[PDB]
Amino acid sequence: KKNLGRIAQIIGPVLDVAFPPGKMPNIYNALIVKGRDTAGQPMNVTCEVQQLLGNNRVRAVAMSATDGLTRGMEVIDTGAPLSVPVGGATLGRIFNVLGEPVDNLGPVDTRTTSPIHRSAPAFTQLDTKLSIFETGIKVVDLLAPYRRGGKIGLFGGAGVGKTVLIMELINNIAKAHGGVSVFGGVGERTREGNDLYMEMKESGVINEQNIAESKVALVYGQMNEPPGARMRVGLTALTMAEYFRDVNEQDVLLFIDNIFRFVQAGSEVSALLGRMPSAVGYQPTLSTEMGSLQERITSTKEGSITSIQAVYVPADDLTDPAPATTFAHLDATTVLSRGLAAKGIYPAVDPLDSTSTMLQPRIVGEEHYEIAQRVKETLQRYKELQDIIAILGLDELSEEDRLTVARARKIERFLSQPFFVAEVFTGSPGKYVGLAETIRGFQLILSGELDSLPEQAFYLVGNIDEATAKAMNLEMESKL
Amino acid sequence: EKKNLGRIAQIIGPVLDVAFPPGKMPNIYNALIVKGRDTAGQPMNVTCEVQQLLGNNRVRAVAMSATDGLTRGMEVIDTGAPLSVPVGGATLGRIFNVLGEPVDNLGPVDTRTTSPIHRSAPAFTQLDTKLSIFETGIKVVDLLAPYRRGGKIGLFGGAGVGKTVLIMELINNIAKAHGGVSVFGGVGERTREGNDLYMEMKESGVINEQNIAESKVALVYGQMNEPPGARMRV
Amino acid sequence: RADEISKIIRERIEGYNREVKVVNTGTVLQVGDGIARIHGLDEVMAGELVEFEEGTIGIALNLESNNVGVVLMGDGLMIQEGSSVKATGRIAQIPVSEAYLGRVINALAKPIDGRGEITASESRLIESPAPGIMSRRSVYEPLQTGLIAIDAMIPVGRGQRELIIGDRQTGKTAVATDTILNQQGQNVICVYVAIGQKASSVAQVVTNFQERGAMEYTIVVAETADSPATLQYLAPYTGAALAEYFMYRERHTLIIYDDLSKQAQAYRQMSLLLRRPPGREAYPGDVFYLHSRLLERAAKLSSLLGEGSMTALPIVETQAGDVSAYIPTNVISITDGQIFLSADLFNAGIRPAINVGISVSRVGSAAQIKAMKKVAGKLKLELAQFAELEAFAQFASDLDKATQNQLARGQRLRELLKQPQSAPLTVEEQVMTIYTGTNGYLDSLELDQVRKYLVELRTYVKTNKPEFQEIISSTKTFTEEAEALLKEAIQEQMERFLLQ
Amino acid sequence: VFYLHSRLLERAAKLSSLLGEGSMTALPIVETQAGDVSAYIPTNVISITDGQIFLSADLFNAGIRPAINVGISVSRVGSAAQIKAMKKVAGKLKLELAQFAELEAFAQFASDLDKATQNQLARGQRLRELLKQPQSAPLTVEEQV
Amino acid sequence: VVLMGDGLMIQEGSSVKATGRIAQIPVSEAYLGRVINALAKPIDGRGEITASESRLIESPAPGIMSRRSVYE
Amino acid sequence: ATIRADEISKIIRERIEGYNREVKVVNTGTVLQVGDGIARIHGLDEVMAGELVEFEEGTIGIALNLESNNVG
Amino acid sequence: ANLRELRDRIG
C-alpha cells in the first residue's frame, strides 16, 4: 500500500525486503511480492515478516516458492497478520495455507475473515469437565480413554500407524459428532490427502450435492510445499476451528496430521533466519513455537475442541526434542510400538507406554479402572519375565508364571482389532467394539475361563464372541 | 596498585570486557576490582580476573561475584598482582571465600601476609625424591592402602558412610601425632552442608571456638550460589 | 457512583507534583524472536527493566559495546525499529504480602484467576541472595509428605531441597500434590510453580486444591507454555521471592518447582537468541548457576532470624532413563537428596513408583520424629533383605524357611508401600502401619487382603483408640503404652476381620 | 534435505481421469550404513515414500533371497494394488506371516509343543521356502496365484 | 552460483551473462534407449536426441484435485 | 571478516601519518592481541614461517600464521 | 534410541 518495499536478498525461502526508512511492517505481517509467472505474466507470492533487521530490512519467509524471483521486486505491505476466511464458507472445501480454495470450485466468501495469529484463551475461560468419548477401539477404550474436549496425541515412527488410526477415528466419530470437524494436513503426503477427500465424499460427509450441508473443512500443506507453508498451515486450520468454537459455539473436532512437520519446518527456516542452532538441530524456540499453537487449542467453557494429533517420532526416538515437547501438551498420549507392528498387533499401540489422564477411578468407574490395571500389570510382568524366558526355557517356569505368560499372550493377541478403514491391509472386515464388550472380554480372558482357546483365536477379532467362534473354527480345521 | 584505572566495556553474564588506557593494562591471571554500585545505594565492589587480552586496549575477565546492577563505564581498578588471599596463622579456624573474605561473621582477618593464588609449582631441584609413608593412625588405611607424603589420595565413598568423621579424624590425627595442619577447600560447597560441617568441626574440638588460632583447620568455601569463576578458583 | 469518579480524579490530580528526572533512553535497532538490540542505554545495568514505546517491558541482559540485547516479557510485534526504550532504573521486583494465599498468579505476581487484585504493601526483588552460612541451622524438623515410603525411607526435613526426579508420567506431580495436601494440619505456606505447563493442567491442579481445601495456605504461580521464555525463566524466582517473604516472617514454607527442566529450556532459548556460546545440549554455561542460585535460597534459618524455613521440591524429568543427562546431573549435584520414580514400578502396580534402592536423602533420620525412626529401622532392614533375595523369588519353594519367610515378609511389605493418589497418611497412621507390617502381624493374610486389612485397621484405631494418636502426636515417640494400645487394636481388628 | 527429497518424490503420482490417468511410479533406493534407520537420510526418505521394502544382509547370507525383511517392510497402498485373484488368495498373508514369525521365535525356547502349533510352524516354513526367487527370473500373476 | 561443470578456466574478472532461463531440459520421445547425463545430453555416443517440448527440471507436484487413488 | 587484529587505532594513525615511504618495520614487531597460547604480532614483515621470535618478557615464540598484515 | 537399547541390553 503506502508501505511499498523492495526485495534485497533471496536465499531459498527466506528473503529480506528493504522498506522505507520510517515506514515498516510489523512482525508477522503479510507481504505480497509482485512476482512474475513462469510465462510472461504477473504472479503473487505471499511472505510473512519474521524479524526486523535494523537497516529498514525485514526478513520474511515465503509461503510459495522463490525460484524465478529477482531482487528489487516491489513488495506490498498489507499491514495485516495474514487473515483467513472462516465460517460456513469453509465447510466442505479443501483449503490452503493462504485460505484459498484448491478444490477447483468457486471462490470463498471473504466477508468473514480471521487472522492466522492469536493468543490462547485466558485462564478464567477454561473447562474442568473430565469426560470420556468412546472410540470403538479396544486398546484405547480400555487403556488410554480419550478425553472429550481434550488434546489427544498419536506417537510413532513411519509405518506403525497414526494415519490408519486417525482415519479409523475419523470413520468412527466424524459423522457421529454433532458439531463440525476440521482436518489439517501438515507436511503429510498428497496421495493420502486425495484418498481422505474421496473417502469423505463417499461417507456422506462432504455431501457433494450441496457443499454447505457438509461438516468438514480440509486445510492442506503437504511435503511438496515450502517450509513457510508447512509452518503456517497448522495456524490456518486452527483459526478455522477457533471460529467454530467461539463464534458458532459448537463442539469442533480438530484432526491434525503430523505436527512434527510444523516443528521441522521452523527448524528448516531457522538457520536462514540467523538463529543459532539449539539441541540436536532444532530451532532455539521449539518449546515456545509448540506452546503457542498448542495452548491456542483449548476448550474455552463456551465451546469445546477435541484435538487428535499425529506426532511423528523420528527414528523411533521417543526422547527426541520434538515429541518430548509435545508429550507435556497432550492429555491422553498413545504410543505406537514398532515391535507390535513387526508381528501384526495392529493397532500397534504400546499398552504400557500409552498413558491417559482419564484413567482415574472417579472418572472411569471401578470395574474399568481395575481391569485396566490388571491388564497393565500382566503385560508388565510378562515383559519383565521376557529374558528369564528367552534364554533359560519356558518349560522350567513356575506354575504362576506359565499362567501369566499364557494370559499375557492372549491379551496381546486380543488387543489387536480389524479396522474398517484397514480392510485393505488386514484383508478382513472391520469391527467396532464398544467399551462394555471390551471390559467383559478382558475380564473373561484374565478371569481364567478362556484358558482353553488357542492364542491365535484371539488375533484380529472384534469381540470375545468372535474370539470363541474363531476358536471353534480353528478346532474344526485341526480335527477335520 | 596505582592509577591504572579501567572502564567496563561489556557485561554479558559473569564475563565482562574492560577497557584500559593504551599503554597500561593488566597481565593475564591478574585481579581487577570493579568499583561498582549497589541498587540499594551503597558502593559494592566486584573482583574479576583477567583471562585474555582482546587487542585494542581491552581485556576480558570473569567476575568472582555476581554481575547484577553493573553498568558500562563503571570504574575498574588494576591490582598488578593475581588474587592475593591472606595466609598464615590468622587463617585458622576461619571460613573464607575465594577472595579470602571471611564469611563466618567472626570479624576481620588481618591481611598482614597475602600470597598470590596464581603461582608456579615448586622446582624440580626443590622436589623430594623420597617415597615416604604418611601415618594416619587408622589401622585399615595405614595397613592396606597406605598414603603418601606429598601425594594425592582419591576419596570414593557415597553418602551416609563415615566420610566427614573420617576427614575430621584425619585432621585431628595429623595435628596431634605430627605438627601438622589442615586446609579444607569446598568447591561447590552446599551452604547448609557447609554450615553443618562448620558446626561439627567446632563441636569435635577441631575448631577451638573458645580460642581461635589454636584450631587445626582453615575452611575455604566456594559455594554453589557463587559464579563459576569463584567455584573454579576456590 | 456519581461523585466517586470525580473525587478519584481530584485525588489523582493532586497526588503528583510534576517532578522531573533524567531517564536513560535508547532506540530500537533490530527486533525479532523475543529479543531486541537497542542502541543508547549507556547507564543501564545488567538485569534492569526497560519499558518500550508500545508498553512491552524487557530486561537488559547482555550489555555489549554497540547495543543492549533485551529479552521481552511479551510480544515484540508492535516495536517500531526506532521507538524509544526508556529504562526504569528498577530491577525486577514483585509486590509481596499475605493476600496471595488462595490466589493464582503469573510470573509478574499478577492474578490470572480474575478474582480481583492483591493488596500488597511490601516489595521484594525477584533475584534475592541466599542465606549465608551463619544465618542457617541444621535441618531437624520433619516435613511430612503423607507418603509412607517417603517419610520412612527418604525423609524430608524443613529447609531441605529434595529432588523429585523421574521419567514422564511416573507420578511426580502426584507426589507434589500429596505433599501440599498433607500440609493441611501443619502451618506450612505452600507454593506451586507451574512452568511451561498446559493451562488446563494448571486448572485441574488448582481446582483439586480448592476441592480438598489446600487452597487457603497455597499460592499458585503459573507460566504456561505459550508464555515468552523470559516469563517461564522468571517464574521460579518469583515463587522463591514469595516464599522468602513468608520465610523471613518466621513462617515455614514449601515450594515445588514443577519441571525445572522447562525453566532450563526457556533460559537456553533466550541464551541462544542473545547469541551466547552454548555448551552441552546447547545449554549456556551458566545453567548450573541458574539452578544453584535458585536452590540455595531454600534454607533453614538460624533461630535469631526467626526459625523459619523454605523446603524446596524441584521436579526434573529424565528422558529414556538418562539420569546422566545434563540438567538432571546439575540438579542432582545441587539438591540435598533425590527421589527416583520408575515406569517399571509404576506399571507393575506399585504406586507411588518410588525406587527406594536408588533414592537418597543426605539429611537422614534427623528429618524424622522419634516415633518414626524406631519402626523405620526395621522397615529399612527388611526391605533391604527383600531386595537381596528378590532374584530368589522364583525358587522360593526349594529354599530355607528363614529365606522364604523374608521373601514373603518383603513381598507383603511392598503391599503397604502402595498408596492411592491424593490420599496422604498422617504420621501416626503411617507409624502404626509400619509397626504392624514390620513386626509381622500381617504375615498371615493374603497379599490381596493386606491393603484392605490395613485400611480397616487404621480407621479402627483412629476411631476406637484415640489415645494412640494422642501419644504419638504429643510425645512424638513410640511409647510402650502406644505399643500396648496398638497390639490390642491389632488383635481386635484381626478378630473382626476374620469374622469377615 | 527433507524438502529436497519430498519435492522430488511428490512428483510421482497417479493422475485423475481428467488428466488422462497417466502415472509415474517411483522406486527410490537408500543405502544404510550397517543397518542404521536412525541415520538422518534413511528416516528422512522412509517417511516420504508410501511403502518401503527392507532388505537384510542376514537373510541374504542365510540364503533368503530376495532378502526382504518383511515385518518392517510395508505397503501403504495395500491390496488395492493387486488383482482380485491376488486379493483373494494373498489378502491375509502378511499378518499371518508376521504372527508365524513371532510364534516360531517363541517356540525356540519351548520344550513340549502342541500339534496345532507344530502344524502352524510347518506351514510357515513351507511358505518361507516358497518366498524365494532367483534374480532376473520372475513369475507372472497367474504363476504367483 | 553453483557451476554445473566445475570450470577450471573461469577467470577472476571474466564476464557472466544471464540467460533469462530457469533450468530446463529438452524432453521428448526418442530418449527411449538413450543414455544421458542429467543435462539430457547423450553420453552413449550414438548421436544427438531430437526434442522440442522442454519441460522444466523443477516442475510442481500434482495437487489433491488432479490426483487419483492408486488402484492399478 | 569485518574485523582484523591490526584494526587498532594507533597503527592506522601511523599509516595516515605517512602513506608512501621507503622502510617498513623489518625485524621490529609490536605485539597486540595476546590471547590463548597465541599472539597476533603486527610487524615482522620479513619474518619466515617457523621463525623463532623473542619477546620483551623473554618468552620464545614460533611464527606460525603469517597473515597479510599481522603474523600470529 | 541406540543408547537406550544398549542400556536395556545391559540390564
Add this chain to the structure above:
Amino acid sequence: DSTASRYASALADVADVTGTLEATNSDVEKLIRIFSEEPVYYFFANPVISIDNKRSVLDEIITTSGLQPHTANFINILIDSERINLVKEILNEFEDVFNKITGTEVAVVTSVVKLENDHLAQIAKGVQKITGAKNVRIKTVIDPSLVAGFTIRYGNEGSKLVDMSVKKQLEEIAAQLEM
C-alpha cells in the same frame, strides 16, 4: 568498537596531533556530501572497478575540493585496505570522536516553536555543567510532533532525557489507568 569507530578515531588522532581540528572537521563535512550522492559512492565501492581508476579520481577530488593532506591520506588508505565500502559509516562516526576530543557535547532541543535564545543559552549552560562540556554544541529542530514545550537529549547519542511537553499527559493517563 567497530571499523567506522576505529578508523574515525585514527583520523581524529592524526588530525589532533598536528592541530587541524577545524580543518579536518571542514574536510570531513565536505567529504560527507562528496560520498553522499550515491553514484560516486557506488563508484568508489564496486570492487570490479580498477584501483588505479579509483585513485586517479580520488586525487582529482583532493585537488578540486582542497582537502587536507592527512584526510586525503586517510581516504587513500581506505582505498588501499578495502574498507571504502564503510566510508559512509566512518564519516558519520567521525563527529562523535571529534566531539570527544574537543570536549564538546551536542544535544538536540526538540521544541514546538522557535526560541529567543536566552532560555536556549540557559539550557546549554545547564547541560554543559551537568556533563562537563567546556563548550556544548547545543542544537534544535522545529518539530510539530511535540505538544507544548521542549526536551533535551544528551549523553552519548541521546542517552539521557528530561521532558516537559508530553510527560505530564503521559503520567496523567498512567495515573488514571492505575495499572
